[PDB]
Structure formats: C-alpha cells, structure tokens
Design an enzyme around this catalytic site. Structure first.
Site, PDB file in Angstrom:
ATOM      1  N   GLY A 120       0.924  -1.597  -0.334  1.00  0.00           N
ATOM      2  CA  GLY A 120      -0.287  -0.233  -0.357  1.00  0.00           C
ATOM      3  C   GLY A 120       0.632   1.111   0.116  1.00  0.00           C
ATOM      4  O   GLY A 120       2.142   1.421   0.091  1.00  0.00           O
ATOM      5  N   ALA A 166       1.333   3.706   2.245  1.00  0.00           N
ATOM      6  CA  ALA A 166       1.601   3.896   3.355  1.00  0.00           C
ATOM      7  C   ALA A 166       3.118   2.930   3.544  1.00  0.00           C
ATOM      8  O   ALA A 166       3.730   3.451   3.915  1.00  0.00           O
ATOM      9  CB  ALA A 166       0.587   3.813   4.274  1.00  0.00           C
ATOM     10  N   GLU A 219      -1.418   0.234  -7.542  1.00  0.00           N
ATOM     11  CA  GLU A 219      -1.125   1.512  -8.559  1.00  0.00           C
ATOM     12  C   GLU A 219       0.274   2.251  -8.368  1.00  0.00           C
ATOM     13  O   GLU A 219       1.373   2.019  -7.593  1.00  0.00           O
ATOM     14  CB  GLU A 219      -2.257   2.105  -7.542  1.00  0.00           C
ATOM     15  CG  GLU A 219      -1.624   3.667  -6.432  1.00  0.00           C
ATOM     16  CD  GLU A 219      -1.386   4.700  -7.068  1.00  0.00           C
ATOM     17  OE1 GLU A 219      -0.708   5.269  -8.187  1.00  0.00           O
ATOM     18  OE2 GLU A 219      -1.250   5.091  -6.227  1.00  0.00           O
ATOM     19  N   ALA A 250      -7.707  -0.362  -5.655  1.00  0.00           N
ATOM     20  CA  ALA A 250      -8.964  -1.445  -4.866  1.00  0.00           C
ATOM     21  C   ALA A 250     -10.211  -0.305  -4.525  1.00  0.00           C
ATOM     22  O   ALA A 250     -10.772  -0.666  -4.063  1.00  0.00           O
ATOM     23  CB  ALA A 250      -8.170  -2.677  -3.568  1.00  0.00           C
ATOM     24  N   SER A 287      -1.053  -0.133   5.931  1.00  0.00           N
ATOM     25  CA  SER A 287      -2.423   0.680   6.933  1.00  0.00           C
ATOM     26  C   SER A 287      -4.204   0.235   6.393  1.00  0.00           C
ATOM     27  O   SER A 287      -4.698  -0.527   5.840  1.00  0.00           O
ATOM     28  CB  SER A 287      -3.127   1.600   5.353  1.00  0.00           C
ATOM     29  OG  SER A 287      -2.715   1.787   4.443  1.00  0.00           O
ATOM     30  N   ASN A 339      -1.930   7.563  13.726  1.00  0.00           N
ATOM     31  CA  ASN A 339      -1.761   8.110  13.023  1.00  0.00           C
ATOM     32  C   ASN A 339      -2.272   9.435  14.542  1.00  0.00           C
ATOM     33  O   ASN A 339      -1.016  10.054  14.206  1.00  0.00           O
ATOM     34  CB  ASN A 339      -2.583   8.701  12.245  1.00  0.00           C
ATOM     35  CG  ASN A 339      -1.812   7.835  10.898  1.00  0.00           C
ATOM     36  OD1 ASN A 339      -0.498   7.245  10.765  1.00  0.00           O
ATOM     37  ND2 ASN A 339      -2.335   8.585   9.205  1.00  0.00           N
ATOM     38  N   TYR A 371       3.491  13.327   7.003  1.00  0.00           N
ATOM     39  CA  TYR A 371       3.480  11.919   6.413  1.00  0.00           C
ATOM     40  C   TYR A 371       4.923  11.595   6.627  1.00  0.00           C
ATOM     41  O   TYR A 371       5.275  11.199   7.053  1.00  0.00           O
ATOM     42  CB  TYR A 371       2.952  11.170   4.825  1.00  0.00           C
ATOM     43  CG  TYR A 371       1.403  10.894   5.515  1.00  0.00           C
ATOM     44  CD1 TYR A 371       0.708  11.532   6.686  1.00  0.00           C
ATOM     45  CD2 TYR A 371       0.544  10.754   4.747  1.00  0.00           C
ATOM     46  CE1 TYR A 371      -0.231  11.266   6.946  1.00  0.00           C
ATOM     47  CE2 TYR A 371      -1.052  10.320   4.444  1.00  0.00           C
ATOM     48  CZ  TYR A 371      -1.596  10.701   5.770  1.00  0.00           C
ATOM     49  OH  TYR A 371      -2.828  10.885   5.583  1.00  0.00           O
ATOM     50  N   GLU A 410      12.926 -14.549  20.811  1.00  0.00           N
ATOM     51  CA  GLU A 410      12.585 -13.888  21.948  1.00  0.00           C
ATOM     52  C   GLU A 410      11.690 -13.286  22.735  1.00  0.00           C
ATOM     53  O   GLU A 410      10.810 -12.777  23.707  1.00  0.00           O
ATOM     54  CB  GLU A 410      14.219 -13.722  22.773  1.00  0.00           C
ATOM     55  CG  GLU A 410      14.761 -14.925  23.091  1.00  0.00           C
ATOM     56  CD  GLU A 410      16.256 -15.029  24.049  1.00  0.00           C
ATOM     57  OE1 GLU A 410      17.197 -13.457  22.869  1.00  0.00           O
ATOM     58  OE2 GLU A 410      17.032 -14.684  25.124  1.00  0.00           O
TER      59      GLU A 410
HETATM   60  N1  LIG Z   1       1.560   7.348   9.420  1.00  0.00           N
HETATM   61  C1  LIG Z   1       1.451   7.352   8.095  1.00  0.00           C
HETATM   62  N2  LIG Z   1       0.156   6.781   7.697  1.00  0.00           N
HETATM   63  C2  LIG Z   1      -0.316   6.882   6.272  1.00  0.00           C
HETATM   64  C3  LIG Z   1       0.381   7.636   5.426  1.00  0.00           C
HETATM   65  N3  LIG Z   1      -0.065   7.626   4.261  1.00  0.00           N
HETATM   66  C4  LIG Z   1      -1.311   6.875   4.306  1.00  0.00           C
HETATM   67  N4  LIG Z   1      -0.977   6.485   5.437  1.00  0.00           N
HETATM   68  C5  LIG Z   1      -2.969   6.135   5.807  1.00  0.00           C
HETATM   69  O1  LIG Z   1      -3.081   5.129   5.550  1.00  0.00           O
HETATM   70  C6  LIG Z   1      -4.301   5.096   4.889  1.00  0.00           C
HETATM   71  C7  LIG Z   1      -4.905   5.402   3.139  1.00  0.00           C
HETATM   72  O2  LIG Z   1      -4.198   3.835   2.746  1.00  0.00           O
HETATM   73  P1  LIG Z   1      -3.612   3.695   1.845  1.00  0.00           P
HETATM   74  O3  LIG Z   1      -2.049   4.268   2.541  1.00  0.00           O
HETATM   75  O4  LIG Z   1      -4.028   4.355   0.403  1.00  0.00           O
HETATM   76  O5  LIG Z   1      -3.460   2.693   1.390  1.00  0.00           O
HETATM   77  P2  LIG Z   1      -4.153   1.469   0.368  1.00  0.00           P
HETATM   78  O6  LIG Z   1      -3.980   0.164   0.324  1.00  0.00           O
HETATM   79  O7  LIG Z   1      -3.444   1.204  -0.701  1.00  0.00           O
HETATM   80  O8  LIG Z   1      -4.927   1.904  -0.229  1.00  0.00           O
HETATM   81  P3  LIG Z   1      -5.182   1.435  -1.894  1.00  0.00           P
HETATM   82  O9  LIG Z   1      -5.239   3.412  -2.393  1.00  0.00           O
HETATM   83  O10 LIG Z   1      -6.922   1.677  -2.379  1.00  0.00           O
HETATM   84  O11 LIG Z   1      -4.787   0.427  -2.397  1.00  0.00           O
HETATM   85  C8  LIG Z   1      -5.174   6.359   5.512  1.00  0.00           C
HETATM   86  O12 LIG Z   1      -5.441   5.990   6.832  1.00  0.00           O
HETATM   87  C9  LIG Z   1      -4.131   7.362   6.001  1.00  0.00           C
HETATM   88  O13 LIG Z   1      -3.896   7.340   7.805  1.00  0.00           O
HETATM   89  C10 LIG Z   1       2.036   7.862   6.138  1.00  0.00           C
HETATM   90  O14 LIG Z   1       2.335   8.047   5.346  1.00  0.00           O
HETATM   91  N5  LIG Z   1       2.552   8.196   6.878  1.00  0.00           N
HETATM   92 MG   LIG Z   2      -2.929   0.720  -2.801  1.00  0.00          MG
END
Ligand SMILES: Nc1nc2c(ncn2[C@@H]2O[C@H](COP(=O)(O)OP(=O)(O)OP(=O)(O)O)[C@@H](O)[C@H]2O)c(=O)[nH]1
Ligand SMILES: [Mg+2]
Ligand SMILES: Nc1nc2c(ncn2[C@@H]2O[C@H](COP(=O)(O)OP(=O)(O)OP(=O)(O)O)[C@@H](O)[C@H]2O)c(=O)[nH]1
Ligand SMILES: Nc1nc2c(ncn2[C@@H]2O[C@H](COP(=O)(O)OP(=O)(O)O)[C@@H](O)[C@H]2O)c(=O)[nH]1
Ligand SMILES: [Mg+2]
Lengths: 48, 427, 55, 430, 430
Positions: free
Chosen positions: D10, D12, D62, D90, D131, D197, D215, D245
């Site tokens: 993803g 994140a 993506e 997705a 995430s 977060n 972020y 451990e």
């Molecule tokens: N701590 C942190 N959280 C993040 C960051 N980027 C996204 N998030 C969290 O990730 C969530 C968003 O989902 P995505 O990061 O797009 O995860 P994904 O599976 O790729 O979702 P899709 O794009 O539909 O495929 C949000 O709730 C954000 O708070 C980041 O750089 N740091």
């Molecule tokens: Mg994604």
C-alpha cells in the site's frame, strides 16, 4: 447499424438496470471453531 | 496509465469543453500549436491520461465533439486553441436542433449515433488502459439532454465496468432559457439515474451569484462563468495526473460518497475565490480554504445544504501543505456542525491531498458533497412538469416525433420515487 | 560495563555536535521564513496590480 | 548470516519503506548507489562488486507511489524486480483488493518474495507493513498473509500496522475494511504491532517541537522503532534478544499477541541540550500515557509482560535500578499471574539521525513494547462504528458486487466479538 | 576425431542456422570469410592453406531464404554444393512437400549429405531443424528422416524443431501438418527436442528486456543451447557427456524420448549488475515454469531423469549442493523409480557473446534438458484442434489432390492417441 437502433416502444422502464441487494437472512455464524488458535482458558477453570 | 475519453454534446458542452482544454493546456504547458514548451519534467509524467502524441512532438487531446448542427463547432475552431483538435473527431449532423428532446433522441439521434460510436471506438481502444468516460452536457436543451443520454446508454452496454462520469447544468429556478425544460429535464433524469455512475449538477444562477458576490466582476461573461466550471473538472482528475501524499482517484470518490445505487447526484464548489481587493486582507491558510468550501454561498448549485442533511462530503487540497492541518479541520468542521450530518454514518468527510497546485495559486481546494437538499431541485421541476402536463401543453410536438405518452408517466414516477428515496434516508 | 566513560572526551563531541545541528535547523527555518514571505506576498502583489490596472 | 525480509504493501507501506531504508543506508554507511565511500548481511546482500541490495519488496496496485521511488534518488539501490505495481488500486474496497483485483497479482509477488528467501540462508522472520483502512493494505494484506502462512509455516511473521484513529479518519468505509482484515491477521500473524496516526500526530507536536507535521515526519519516527527492534541482531550488546525471544516473552496466549509501542526520549535538539537524560529519566517517560504510539491510556487496563530495549550509553547496572523503581510506581498495574513481568535488552550503538532530521543525537535512548488490556478500548470503538453502518446496510452493495458473499460481514463481527471476550477474561484475576 | 552434421530445412531451420554459424564462427575465432586473423574441426573442415568450411547443408524448396545467404556476408564461407534451393515452395501442404515436389530434390540432397559424411572420420550424430507447421519442414523433413534411417542405421539423429504454439498461429492448416509429421518423427528420431515461439516470445520480453523482439532475437537464443550442448565434445571439462550418454540417460523407453530444454542465466546487462549469479541461483532459475522454452507447466505433472550442463568456473561441490537443494523442493515431483534422477556435466568454456547481442557477459551458465510428462498437455492441444477441422472435412481436398490418400488421416490420428497413451501409462503410479 440495424442492431443499434432503438424503437420508441422499448422505452427504458424503471429497475431494468438498477439492481437491488437482497435482504440478508443469514446462517448462524460459526464463531469459535473458525480459528485454529485455541481460546484462552478461563479464570474459574484453574487446577486446584 | 488511466486514460479518460472526453465527450462534448451541444452548445453548452462544446463551449464548456473548449474552455476546459485552455485550462489543461496551460497547466501541462502545451503551446496552442500542439507542441510542448513547458517548464517542468513533472508535466510529461502522465500526459497520457488526456492526450495522444502524433509523431513530430505534437500532442492531441482525447476529445470528441458532438452536435446536430455545425454552427457552434465552427465558432470553437476559430478560437485560439481550436487548431488542437483532430479534424476527424468533429461529428455533426446537418439538421436543426429543434430544442426538442424526443426529436433529438429518436429522429436525428439514431442517424448520428452510428458514426459517433465508432469515433468513440477509435479513441477508447487506442490506449493501454481506460478508467472511464467524461461527458459534458446540459439538461434543459434538446441536443445535449436528448442525444447525450442516448450515447450514455450505448456506452454503458459496451463498457459496463468503466466509470461514466458526467457533468450537467440544471435549469434555473427564477429565469431559465427554455420553455419546455420541465419535459426535457424529466425525461433526461430517467436516463441519468439508471445509467450514469456519477452526476454533478451546476446551476447558472449560483455562478452569477458567485461572480457578483465574491469576485466583484462588474460584467461577467460566459467565458468567466465557464472558467469556474473548468477548475472543478480539473480538480477531480488532478489525483491521476500528479503525485500526492494521499491519492484519491475517481473510483475512490464514488465508493466513499455513494451509499446507495441511486443517490449519486453531487454539488461542487471551489476555493479559494478571492475578491480582487480582499486579497490584501486575506492571509491564505488551510483553515481559510475550509471556511470557503463549506460556506453555503460558494456552492455552485442553487440548493441550500442547510435545508437538508449531509450524507457524505469530500475535499481535495492542492499544494505542499501539512497533513495534520487538513485532518484537524475535517474533524473540526464535522463536530462543530453536527446538526447537518447523519448519525448512522460517522466520519462523513473524506479528504485528499495533491502536491502541485494550479499556477499562481500557492494552494487551492475542491469540494464535492451529497445532501438531501437535492429534493428542493427535483420538486421544482416536478411541480412545473405536472401543471404543464395536467393540460396537454407543448406535448404534441414531442408526440409528432413519435414518443408515446406512457414514457412521461414512467419518467415522472421514477423521478417521484427518487424524491421519496431522499426523504426516507433523512431519518 | 558501565563504561560510557568516553564521555570524559566523548560527550563533548556530542554536545558540540548538538550545537552545530541546532544552528543548522535554525538556519533552515530562517531561510524558509524568508522564502515564504517573498513568494506568497510579492507574487500576489503583481496579481493585484495587473488585475486592478487592466480593469 | 541471519536475515530479515521486509514487505511493504500500500501507499502507507511504501512511503514508510523509503524512509526506513533511507535511515538504514545512512546508519550502515552505504551510499544511495549502494557503494561504500559488518551487519550488512542482515538487511542487504552482496551482489558481487562493491554494491549492496536491500532485502525488500514493494507492492501496490497503482503505480504512482512506486514510480516515485523509480524516478527518485534511491532508484539505483533497489533491484527493478522488487518494485511491483498493479494497474488500478482497490478503491479502498476490501472485496476488490481480495477477490477481483488482488488475485490478478498475488502469484507474481509470491514468486519474488520466495526468490529472495533463497538468498537468505539464515532467515528468521519477515516484516510486513499495512494501513488498515486501505483497500490494498487490508484486502491484499489478508490474501498475502494466508498464502504466506502455508508457504513457510513456523517462521515468525511480524507485522506493523496503522490502526485507524479514534476520531481522525480519512475514509468513510474505514470501519468495514478493518474488521474484515481482523479475522485474517488474528489467525495467521505471529505478532502484529499497533500504532495510530492520531497519537503520532499529538506526540510529534508536543514532545518533538513541530508546528505542522506531514506524513514524512511520522514515517521517520516509525523507522527509529524498527531500527531499535532490529539492533539486537545487528550490533553488539550486553543482552541480545532474537525475534523468537520477543515472541515467547510478550504473548501469554495465542489470541492475545497484539502489543503497543513507545519510545523515549523524543525531544528537540535545543531542549536535549538542556538536560542529561539519564537511564531513570528515559525509563520514567516510557510509562506516561502521553508517549504511547496508540491513543489508549493504559490506566484503564492492566499490564502483562513488557519488553524494554536500550540503545546507547546504558549498561545493565542502572537498568536494574530503573525497572526496580518502575515496579514501586502505583500508577502502573500488573496482572497477578505475571510477577516478573519484564524482559530487558541492551545494545551499545546509539541511534542515527538524518539530514533534515526531526531529532537530536541523544547518547542513550530506550524503546518499549508492552502487552496491555487497554487495547480492548480500541476494539470497542471500532465495533460501535461498524454496527451503525451495517444496521442500515450503508455500503454493502459495493463489497457484494466485487465478489464477496455478504455472510462474511457477520462472521467478521463474531471473530472480533470473540477476541473482545478473551482480553477481558484474561484481565480477570483469582 | 568426433564430428556432428547440421542440416537445415525450410525457412525456420535455415534462418536459425544463420545465427548459429555466426555464433560458432565468433566463438572459435574464424572470420566470416573462413580464415584466421583446437576444436575447430568438429564443426569445420580445413580445406588447405588457411581456410575453413562448415559442415552444413541448407535446403529449401524456394530460393529466397537461401539466396539471402548467397548474397550475404557468409557467401565466402560455404561450399556452393551445400546451398541447395528448389523452385516453388510446398505452399504449407504436407502432401505437396513429401510426394509431388519433395521427390524432385530428395535424391540430390541425399548425395551431398553422404558426401559430407565421407570427410567425417569419427561422426557421432546429426543435427536437424524443422518447423512443424510448414510444408517443407514437415513434408520434406519426414521424407528426409525416413531415408536417413536406412542409409546410416543407428547413428544417433537429434532434432531441434519448433512446435506449434498454444494460441499463436500463423497458418490455418498448421494442425494438419503437425500430426502427419508426428508419425514419421516418433519412429525414426533418436531424440527430438521441443521448442515453441510463444514461450520464447514471453521469455525474450521478461528476462531479456526487449519491448518488441523479432525472429532474429529468438534464433540467437536457440544457438546458445546447441553451443552449450555440443561444448562437451569441443572444450575441456571436469565431467564430459557424449551424445550416447545423453541418449541412454534421458530416455527410459523408446517412445518416451521427447525432452524439453531450459537455460540460465538469461539476463540483461543492467540487471546482472544487481545479481551475483552463483551456482545455487542459476540452478534454481532453471526449474521455474517461466524459464521453460515450451509453454507447459512442470507442476502439472511429474519429472523423469534430468541432465545438467555447466559452462564456467564451476566447482563440482557447488554442483552437488545445488542438486541437493533441488531435491528438497516439494513443488518438484519425481517418479519413485529413478531415485538417482540426475546426470551432471562441467565444462570450462564460458558462453560467447555477439555484436548487437541481447545477453549479458556472465562468467558461468547452465543448460537444462529434462524429460517430463507435462508435454502430454501440448499434444492434447493439437488433438483437439485437428478433430474440429476433420469433423467437417475442412481442408481434405488440397491434400488429396496432391496425391495423399485419405486413409492416412485417421492412421496419423491413431498413432498420436497411442503416443498419448504411452506417456500417461508411464506417468501412472508405479
Ligand atoms: N503514518 C502514516 N500513515 C499513512 C501514510 N500514508 C497513508 N497513511 C494512512 O493510510 C490510509 C490510506 O490508505 P492507503 O495508504 O492508500 O492504503 P492502500 O492499501 O494503498 O489503499 P489503496 O490506495 O486503495 O490501494 C490513511 O488512513 C492514512 O492515514 C503515511 O505516510 N504515514
Ligand atoms: Mg494501494
Ligand atoms: N523461431 C523462429 N521461427 C520461425 C522463423 N521463421 C519461420 N518460423 C516459424 O515457421 C513456422 C511455419 O513454417 P514455414 O515458415 O512455413 O517454413 P516451411 O517448413 O519451409 O514451409 P514452406 O515455406 O511453405 O515450405 C511459423 O509458425 C514460424 O513460427 C524464424 O526465423 N525463427
Ligand atoms: N454555463 C454555460 N451555460 C450555457 C452556455 N451556453 C448556453 N448555456 C445554457 O445551456 C442551456 C441550454 O442550452 P442549449 O442551447 O439548449 O444547448 P444544447 O444542448 O446544444 O441544445 C441554456 O439554459 C443556457 O443558459 C455557456 O457558454 N455556459
Ligand atoms: Mg518452405
């Protein structure tokens, strides 16, 4: 071109393309055997 | 690689679309002759979304222009950026519009539909991928309202998976430019409800109110009004074209904002709209954009959100900015005004961030929301329709074209249920 | 063992390094303050003048 | 020598990943091209030449997030095969990322992770990032875990995930994705860490002195924790603690694995110059509710066994005094059946700071992982939000159309409900 | 000493041979004219003075493909008696290329090959190339093998033929030609290797990074395998395998001879920068379904005995460790009988590169030939395609009009069923 043409008598009736989700009556959920990790032993079941 | 095919119908569609390509061309940096003369490498990353390249360094948009009479088309080409379009994508008839829906749908629509689909077939199947289509048309007219919906049905049949995003202009409540609009809009809504994935509603009166109240433009023209609309269509697809901290494309927007298949009509607004003299007072902050977007006056549709309740809301932010500042505002605006949000859906506000803002504007925002206030706009067209329908008004013009009277009753009934559908979910 | 003893000549490099990174951070935010004020205000100054005077 | 493999799922996971490997390459002393201007074997492989390559795989549906790495400065470090990108994401839909679109790419990735495990002679575990709210993070994360469980069996699959925040939210369908993924993680994961977060949002403003973070800052704070956890395997220390451990000491039972995170000292450069930050000071700061990376106060719950990791000056003498003091504190509870309650680890290499860094070079620091019943607070909040949406069937049509059978919604309800019963039953004492 | 004769028939065979003799000439160090600026003599004859001539025969029933060589650079290398051209091609008709037109040139061709065999004092095999779908590759190739069976007897005859692809097809009558040649090949061939364009296309795009390959790129790949196959007779090595040793080890029976082939490493220059490519890695790459040059899955069935060939600085121990690792793969199925299952060979001469080439300059490489039951999947395709056409008698008039008797169509169908029976009977449980 003959296949594309749409006569007035075939006007789009309601509900032809917007399908509805059935109301979900359900089976009883298979709760505790759905996981291979055994459940924790309880407080009162301690060996004396 | 998420290509989008652009379709323009009618006088409203071609003028809006022509101004739309002026905005994109400057953002990407394309000279009106069609050659790249830009300033940043990031522009050439994902120009494939909207453009094709002719060998020689000339980029051509994925645009198809549709009309029943060629009068408006030649006015567009004489424009500065008219040379850009491919000459063979100009598909037109040789007959009068009639400002009539049935005549556009049945008499002239069937003839031109054959050629238009294959021109669509050229652009739709020439790219590595296709996410969805993009339609611009008005509902009060006869060509955009009638012929536009006919193509919408054929597009759905051939391409069911793709997202059929459409942008529509709704007839105004005080003065509207056509007598027979209540017939045209009622029939057009029947096709839009069942076929389109996303529909955006724009009212001309709000655009006038926005220009006079905020921008203080003493003489706003249709170029300036269409300039405001071009910003919103630019904003939605900006997640595809440029990198960001949180991407949100078209399909993410539809899943989040649409809770049920038929409730998908949307209202839009754009910030910051700065008065030419108020700028010296306005320090542009992230909360400042939040104030404008949720402000009722900025809305581009003349349906007051306060008279209804919100179901979902979405905001896009463009520019390098703090991710905390955006997220805090979404929580702040939601908790402060809980009376306008539904209980059984928490976190009603969706958010997104983009990196590259529009030129000059160091940050910008876009809003898309869904509310039960749309019951105001449908009750208007229904009330006008019934009294025009109770006596046999202009109907004979439509029946002479061949439309059966049962279509109107089917059309109104479907429209009536969607009014009730918004009523029941308010509880 | 409890031999962070190098601090006899090891924490002094640390604290002097702490000072140099402190100054680097303040230089970074100072230049960012100067960068922001010119960009945001004075490009806007041109937007005000052009739009008003052409009107 | 001994190896750990990292997988990033993803948006994140990926953009957490580039921050983590930016930290690691600077820590070991490796240029972004992989050449040099030891413990390299834990995270890197020797390709021949003077060039090294990370043991990582980046997966998303993506290309935008992955292509940023592809055009970035670090593009030369990674193997082109490790960066795997799909065609369309997705759309924050669990069913789409699990059944329809997820299965189009699952077998391509499983070949690449397995191929990397061939080079890892002494592999001991995986690190997997999520995430919960994301469609690919939750949907494809479940499919990846289920396959990986049977592929490798008794190998520690450690996870580090971003739990949706109590109030801050960016996706409306967010409760739907989290609960469905709850069933997959509970059975298959060996141990999974929670962070949210909102706690990081508050921590990076108060403790670290940043007015408006992004972020980028948060992902750097995560990198410090992973660096502290893996430092025992890489560099010398008075008390080494392997992956196994951690697994044995932290979790009392199978269903109760979920720990929480904490770190100290988190302090600005100009404030760290003010004080000495002895061992007792940093140990005391770990237990204040302000420093939790999950926004749940432990005082509503109780503590089971906790693990402490010290990276710096500290050497066992002052450790024993500190933990002895923390046991005297009557603001901290322990369940009666865990009198010992602690596992301590000590390593000598101090933390590494970054150009444009948010933190100063403290000569000593401590990392904390604890298992507490306060985590049940987070589950209750998620449970209530889901029931409001599902009562009126607010978004079922999207998930059903993308291949899911709706009967899985109530099944995911019961597994979370069963888990909530386990934590409160364990919380009892006799 | 020991000699091998190469024969090229049709468009596909002669075009592959153009690349092959290019590769041989550069590897040995001979200019394209046949002069010098060892193992030379196993492929070439020393005419006198300082000039060399290949042992090859080029035959096609139409002159366009051959005249390219006659006008090309290599025109000085060959002996004009070797270049044989017909008048009009077989028009992709088996009956035309076997009975009506093939008879015109068959006896002229047989004199030249036999005349070439006189100079070969210690000949040990033949190398024959076909394309099954073509009229000349099948109709004339079947005729050529039938005569060579009685002329030379039990000199081993090896074939390298391009089997029709699963979905890619360029001739409509392609299924008709393949079955008719299948009857002739199974009885006369000592052993015939399988290749197809569809798998080589996908291989030439993924492993070698080429956007849009041509027939030129695929032809160089096949030459490497034959160069690796014959390198045992040419250069020194720690473990030598003769043609006879290949023959006995690979086949347990008479009608089960058809192997499939694989090669490793096939990598681009900028990917080899990231990979060491030692013995363990290259051995693992062979058994993946992606690297098979016939688009059939080995996971679909079982393995019989395999043969491995190594070219480079390879030590016999690392060979044994690699083979031991392969036997631990539970995704690889072996038959209970033949527990040994392997024959290994080591040679010291590294692979040769070509100007304008596509491959990397790797210091070691491995070639893989295996016998497996998965090829029954390929025959099931040809069987089903044939039945649909012959049910309605789609193209019988063309073949009957050119002398072919209709009774041969069911008989050729009969044999392929018997061959399909033979493999499954052996593949069955012990
Ligand atoms: N701590 C942190 N959280 C993040 C960051 N980027 C996204 N998030 C969290 O990730 C969530 C968003 O989902 P995505 O990061 O797009 O995860 P994904 O599976 O790729 O979702 P899709 O794009 O539909 O495929 C949000 O709730 C954000 O708070 C980041 O750089 N740091
Ligand atoms: Mg994604
Ligand atoms: N790999 C590879 N295959 C080739 C090449 N040229 C032709 N082919 C294959 O040859 C097959 C058909 O055989 P033909 O080209 O008709 O050759 P032929 O046996 O002489 O048949 P005729 O020309 O009619 O006498 C096609 O399916 C091609 O895939 C080549 O240069 N490389
Ligand atoms: N925003 C905008 N609206 C327009 C423009 N031109 C026409 N309209 C509106 O479009 C509505 C119907 O236009 P019409 O001529 O029927 O377009 P048609 O679809 O080609 O028939 C009218 O109410 C106009 O107010 C324009 O340039 N901009
Ligand atoms: Mg031929």
């Amino acid at each position: 071109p003959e296949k594309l043409r749409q006569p007035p008598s075939q006007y789009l009736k309601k509900g032809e393309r917007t399908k509805k989700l059935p109301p979900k009556e359900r089976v009883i959920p298979k709760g505790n055997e759905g996981l291979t990790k055994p459940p924790v032993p309880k407080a009162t079941e301690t060996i004396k | 690689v998420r290509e989008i095919v652009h379709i323009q119908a009618g006088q409203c569609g071609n003028q809006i679309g022509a101004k739309f390509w002026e905005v994109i061309s400057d953002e990407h940096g394309i000279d009106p002759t069609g050659s790249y003369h830009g300033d940043s490498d990031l522009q050439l990353e994902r120009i494939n979304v909207y453009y094709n390249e002719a060998t020689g360094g000339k980029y051509v948009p994925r645009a198809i222009l549709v009309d029943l009479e060629p009068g408006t088309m030649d006015s567009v080409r004489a424009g500065q950026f008219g040379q850009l379009f491919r000459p063979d994508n100009f598909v037109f008839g040789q007959s009068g519009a009639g400002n009539n829906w049935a005549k556009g749908y049945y008499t002239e629509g069937q003839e031109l539909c054959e050629s238009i689909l294959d021109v669509i077939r050229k652009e739709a199947e020439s790219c590595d991928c296709l996410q969805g289509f993009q339609l611009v048309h008005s509902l009060g007219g006869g060509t955009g309202a009638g012929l536009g919906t006919l193509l919408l049905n054929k597009l759905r049949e051939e391409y069911p998976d793709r997202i059929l995003s459409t942008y529509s202009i709704v007839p105004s409540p005080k003065v509207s430019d056509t007598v027979v609009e209540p017939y045209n809009c009622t029939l057009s809504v029947h096709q839009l409800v069942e076929s389109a994935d996303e529909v955006f509603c724009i009212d001309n009166e709000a655009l006038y109110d926005i220009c006079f109240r905020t921008l203080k433009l003493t003489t706003p023209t249709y170029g300036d009004l269409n300039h405001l609309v071009s910003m919103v269509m630019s904003g939605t697809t900006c997640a595809l074209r440029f990198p960001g901290q949180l991407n949100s494309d078209l399909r993410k927007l539809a899943v989040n904002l649409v809770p049920f298949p038929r409730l998908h009509f949307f209202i839009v607004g754009f910030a910051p709209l700065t008065s030419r003299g108020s700028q010296q007072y306005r320090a542009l902050t992230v909360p400042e954009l939040t104030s404008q977007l949720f402000d009722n006056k900025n809305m581009m549709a003349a349906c007051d959100p306060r008279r209804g309740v919100y179901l979902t809301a979405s905001a896009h932010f463009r520019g390098r900015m703090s991710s905390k500042e955006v997220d805090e505002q979404m929580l702040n605006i939601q908790a402060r005004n809980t009376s306008y949000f539904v209980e059984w859906i928490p976190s009603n506000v969706k958010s997104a961030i983009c990196d590259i803002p529009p030129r000059g504007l160091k940050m910008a925002a876009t809003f898309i929301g869904n509310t039960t206030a749309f019951r105001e706009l449908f009750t208007r067209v229904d009330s006008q329709f019934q009294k025009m329908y109770a006596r046999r008004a202009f109907i004979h013009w439509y029946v002479n074209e061949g439309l059966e009277t049962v279509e109107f009753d089917e059309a109104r009934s479907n429209m009536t249920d969607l009014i009730q559908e918004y009523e029941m979910y308010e509880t | 063992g409890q031999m962070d003893t190098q601090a006899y000549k090891g924490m002094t490099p640390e604290q002097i390094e702490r000072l140099k990174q402190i100054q680097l951070q303040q230089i970074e935010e100072n230049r960012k303050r100067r960068e922001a004020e010119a960009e945001q205000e004075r490009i806007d100054e041109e937007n005000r003048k052009k739009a008003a005077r052409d009107a | 020598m001994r190896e750990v493999i990292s997988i990033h799922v993803g948006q994140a996971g990926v953009q957490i990943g580039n921050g983590c490997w930016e930290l690691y390459c600077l820590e070991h002393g490796i240029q972004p091209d992989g050449q040099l201007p030891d413990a390299f074997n834990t995270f890197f492989s020797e390709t021949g030449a003077g060039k090294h390559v990370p043991r990582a795989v980046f997966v998303d549906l993506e290309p935008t997030v992955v292509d940023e790495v592809r055009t970035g400065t670090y593009r030369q470090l990674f193997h082109p095969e490790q960066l795997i990108s799909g065609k369309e994401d997705a759309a924050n839909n669990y069913a789409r990322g699990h059944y329809t679109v997820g299965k189009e790419i699952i077998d391509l990735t499983l070949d690449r992770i397995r191929k990397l495990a061939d080079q890892c002679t002494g592999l001991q575990g995986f690190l997997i990032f999520h995430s919960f709210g994301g469609g690919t993070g939750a949907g494809f994360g479940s499919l990846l875990l289920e396959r990986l469980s049977v592929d490798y069996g008794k190998k520690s699959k450690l996870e580090f995930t971003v739990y949706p925040s109590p109030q801050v939210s960016t996706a409306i369908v967010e409760p739907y994705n989290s609960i469905l993924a709850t069933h997959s993680m509970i059975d298959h994961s060996d141990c999974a860490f929670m962070v949210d977060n909102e706690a990081l949002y508050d921590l990076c403003r108060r403790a670290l002195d940043i007015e408006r973070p992004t972020y980028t800052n948060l992902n750097r704070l995560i990198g410090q924790v992973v660096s502290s956890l893996t430092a025992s395997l890489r560099f010398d220390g008075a008390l080494n603690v392997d992956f196994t451990e951690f697994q044995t000491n932290l979790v009392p039972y199978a269903r109760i694995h979920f720990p929480i995170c904490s770190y100290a000292p988190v302090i600005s450069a100009e404030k760290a110059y003010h004080e000495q930050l002895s061992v007792a000071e940093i140990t005391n700061s770990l237990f204040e509710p302000a420093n939790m990376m999950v926004k749940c106060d432990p005082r509503h719950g109780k503590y089971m066994a906790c693990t402490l990791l010290y990276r710096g000056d500290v050497v066992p003498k002052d450790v024993s005094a500190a933990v002895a003091t923390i046991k005297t504190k009557r603001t901290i509870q322990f369940v009666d059946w865990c009198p010992t309650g602690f596992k301590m680890g000590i390593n000598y290499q101090p933390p590494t700071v970054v150009p444009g860094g948010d933190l100063a070079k403290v000569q000593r620091a401590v990392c904390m992982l604890a298992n507490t019943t306060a985590i049940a607070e987070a589950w209750s909040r998620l449970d209530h939000k889901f029931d409001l949406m599902y009562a009126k069937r607010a978004f079922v049509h999207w998930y059903v159309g993308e291949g899911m059978e709706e009967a899985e919604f109530p099944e995911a309800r019961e597994d979370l409900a069963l888990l909530e019963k386990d934590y409160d039953e364990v919380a009892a004492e006799s």
